[model samples]
Target chain A: SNAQEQRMSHHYATIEVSQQLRQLLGDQLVILLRETPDGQALERSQNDFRRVLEQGRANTVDSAEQAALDGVRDAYLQLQAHTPALLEAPMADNDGFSEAFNGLRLRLQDLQQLALAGISEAETSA
Target chain B: SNAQEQRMSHHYATIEVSQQLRQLLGDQLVILLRETPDGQALERSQNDFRRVLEQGRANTVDSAEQAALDGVRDAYLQLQAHTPALLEAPMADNDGFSEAFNGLRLRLQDLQQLALAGISEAETSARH
Candidate 1:
């Protein structure tokens, strides 16, 4: 149980890290929309998100966690791929952009649920 | 010391609540700018922020926490006052909008530091 609980806690923490990354991306997008629309700034935010994800992966212990992190990576990249077009024509395709953003949020939420399940398992085991 | 530590812990928790409130406000403002420019949605957000602050104040036990909550209330009120104009002239005064938002953030950060001092005091009182 402690091992499982520890794994779950780390997974939840990783999900939080992803949420913060998404928030930073959203903040940068707001800057693009309202303030100085700098492509470089957006790129830097993306890189920062990437670096954090890499760091999380580097310390991976369990297969389930590795898979969860991989899922987050995929979802984030999907959002990342949409950012360039978004910068050029932000008001062009609202649905697609929202979909990409929400897709990552969805993935993180799903991972959060999975992590919560681990806690439940730990409780039952004890 | 327990009295002060508990107050500090509550103050820290309250600051977290304020941070979440500001994040929601920012999220709503982004929606206004990009997805949908609904004045009522923004109005609802401001109401939500107000309601939460009221809830925090109603449960106050210490004067210091009450004062900290009051500071947050004041900062939030300042931000709320600017929102209507910001919605009308979204790009008119970026600096003012940002300042109002950042003002609340700064107050919360200041409160967080004060709360940390309490934790340090708590640590010193134990196992030393």
Candidate 2:
């Protein structure tokens, strides 16, 4: 029951983010949800948030990378904490949390690409 | 001490092959025994024997493939068992065990080649 409750809280936060994203992007944003390979549906669990935070910590070479990762991780965690009951309620046909999730995913992807590019540059220079 | 003794025995068997090969092929035989990975010193162990046997089973297909692998696996195992004290003794300038090991290696290689070829043929046929 405790795990389910925690999962429900996470889902609520995700929904809130989806709703916010929809509000911000309006017609331009699309949020397609899918289950992860490990059979876990996307929910705002501490573990998922912590993983993003850890990735941010790993890529903190420059202030921009560090600041961006930190900002995203902190923003998402805080948002989830504030909206614990979002998952328990049904999401309407078009909610804004999808947009937020997409934004976060894009930012994280950019950070990874930047980090890999930096590594490639270093190798070439070497 | 027991482990060391067992390893010594395996080495002796390997060395015996080196000697016998020299006798049969004269100067043509070269028996080189280097230390295997994991520092087991390449001494004959039941674990090593079992691994080859297991590989033989994994590669079994038609009679030729099965027979070649099984023959190599069985011959090597039997040779090692018979020459337990071979590892304990020192290797002379030339020994016969090297030839036996090489023969087994070649046979096992053939079996693997045949098995893989069969698989490739099956894949090509499947595409049709």
Using TM-score, give the best candidate's number. 1
Tens-digit lDDT track of model 1 for A14-120:
54454455455554544345323468877787788678777877776656556655665665665455455445544322233333333333332333333334433
Q: Where in model 2 is the C-alpha error above 4 Å? A: A1-40, A44-46, A93-126, B1-128
Error of 2 at B75 (Å): 64
Top candidate, metric lDDT: 1
Q: What is the TM-score of each candidate against the true structure?
A: 0.49, 0.23
The sequence of per-residue lDDT tens digits that candidate 2 reaches over residues A7-105 is: 333332332332233222211112111111111233433355455446435633434334444444545444344222223322223333334334433
Q: Docking category for candidate 2? A: incorrect
* Cα lDDT tens digits for candidate 2, B1-128: 46544443333333232223212221111122211122233343434445545554574454543453454454444434432211111222112333333443333223223322332343334345
Best by DockQ: 1
Q: Backbone collision count in every prediction?
A: 0, 27
Q: Which ten residues in a row have the lowest lDDT in candidate 1 chain A?
A: A92-101
